[PDB]
Amino acid sequence: APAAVDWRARGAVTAVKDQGQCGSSWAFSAIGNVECQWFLAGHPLTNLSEQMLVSCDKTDSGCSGGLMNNAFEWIVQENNGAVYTEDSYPYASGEGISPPCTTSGHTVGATITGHVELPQDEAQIAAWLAVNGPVAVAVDASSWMTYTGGVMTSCVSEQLDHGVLLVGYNDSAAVPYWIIKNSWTTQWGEEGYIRIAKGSNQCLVKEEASSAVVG
Ligand SMILES: Cc1nn(C)cc1C(=O)Nc1nc2ccccc2[nH]1
C-alpha cells in the first residue's frame, strides 16, 4: 500500500452529514460507503438515503442502532441492491424518531451486489482502502465528544458504539493517522472529520471493517 491516501482529494466523498439525535450512525456509515463505491465505479457522486435504511431495514433497529454489514445484506437481499437518493428519501430522523418505511416516491440512485469484510488488521485494511476506497468501520466514540483537532492518540477503546467511514490514511506523518468521516455536522472535529492514530487500534477501528461492493 502507498504511504498516504485521501479519497476526499479524488472527489469520492460526499459532504459531511448530521445524524441528529438518532442512533443511526450505522446507516450513515453504510450509505457513505456505498456513495464512494458508487462513484469509484464510474458513476456520478450521488447523495444516497440513510433514512431509507433507518425506516426500512428491519434487520437493524432504526434510531436505536444497527450494523453496517446488516445494511449491506439488507440492501442486496431485501431491496435488490437498490439504494434510493437522499433527495427522494430525505432524512427525517433528526429529533430521534423515524418516520415509517415507504416504497413509492423514491428514486434508485445506486446499486450494490454484496459486501466484503476486511481483516482485523490495520495494514490489511489500509491495503484494501488504497485500491478500492473508503471503508465502513465501527468505533468506540465515547471519547469523541471533546475532540477538537489533531491526532487522537489514546482514544477510549473499550466498546464499539458508533459507525463511521475511513476515507484515508497517512503513514508518513509524525504520528500516522486514519482520516475518518463522521456524521456530527461540520462543526465537530476537523470539518466533520477526525484523525485517530493508525496502528495502535485506536477506538477499536479495526474490529469491524467492511465495504459494499458495486458491480
Ligand atoms: C448500535 C450501533 N452499532 N453501531 C455500529 C453503531 C450503533 C449506533 O447506534 N451508533 C450511534 N448512536 C448515536 C446516538 C447519538 C449520536 C451518535 C450516535 N451513533
Rounded Cα distance between 209 and 86, Å, is: 24
Is the distance from CB of 66 to CB of 60 less than 8 angstroms?
yes
Single out the residue of 165, 137, 168, 152 nearest to residue 200, CA to CA. 152
Å from CA of 3 to ligand 1 middle: 31
Number of other CB atoms surrounding residue 26 within 10 Å = 28
Q: Where are the domains of the chain?
A: 1-215
At what resolution in Å was this solved?
A: 2.7
Name the structure determination technique.
Answer: X-ray
Rounded Cα distance between 118 and 204, Å, is: 14
| Cβ–ligand 1 contact at 161 (below 6 Å) | yes
- Superfamily in which the 1-215 domain is placed by CATH: Cysteine proteinases (3.90.70.10)
Is the distance from CB of 125 to CB of 118 less than 8 angstroms?
yes
With helix as H, strand as E and coil as C, how does the chain read? CCCEEECCCCCCCCCCCECCCCECHHHHHHHHHHHHHHHHCCCCCCCECHHHHHHHCCCCCCCECCCHHHHHHHHHHHHCCEEEECCCCCCCCCCCCCCCCCCCCCCEEEECCEEEECCCCHHHHHHHHHHHCCEEEEECCHHHCCCCCCEECCCCCCCCCEEEEEEEEECCCCCCEEEEECCECCCCCECCEEEEECCCCHHHCCCCCEEEECC
What residues contact residue 32 under an 8 Å CB cut-off, 6+ apart? 13, 14, 17, 134, 136, 165, 181, 183
| Cβ–ligand 1 contact at 203 (below 6 Å) | no
Q: What are the grid coordinates assigned to 38, written together? A: 458508487
Single out the residue of 50, 5, 34, 10 nearest to residue 183, CA to CA. 50
What residues contact residue 156 under an 8 Å CB cut-off, 6+ apart? 140, 142, 143, 203
Å from CA of 24 to ligand 1 middle: 6
Alpha-carbon separation of residue 54 from 50, 81, 94 (angstroms): 6, 16, 11
Q: What are the grid coordinates assigned to 191, written together? A: 470539518
Å from CA of 173 to ligand 1 middle: 30
Q: Quick one: 22 exposed, middle or buried, by C-beta within 10 A (0-12, 13-18, 19+)?
A: buried
Q: What are the grid coordinates assigned to 119, written together? A: 481483516
Say which amino acid occupies 118: L
Alpha-carbon separation of residue 3 from 18, 125, 131, 153 (angstroms): 31, 13, 13, 20
Length of the chain: 215
The sign one gets for the Cα dihedral 105, 25, 31, 76 is negative
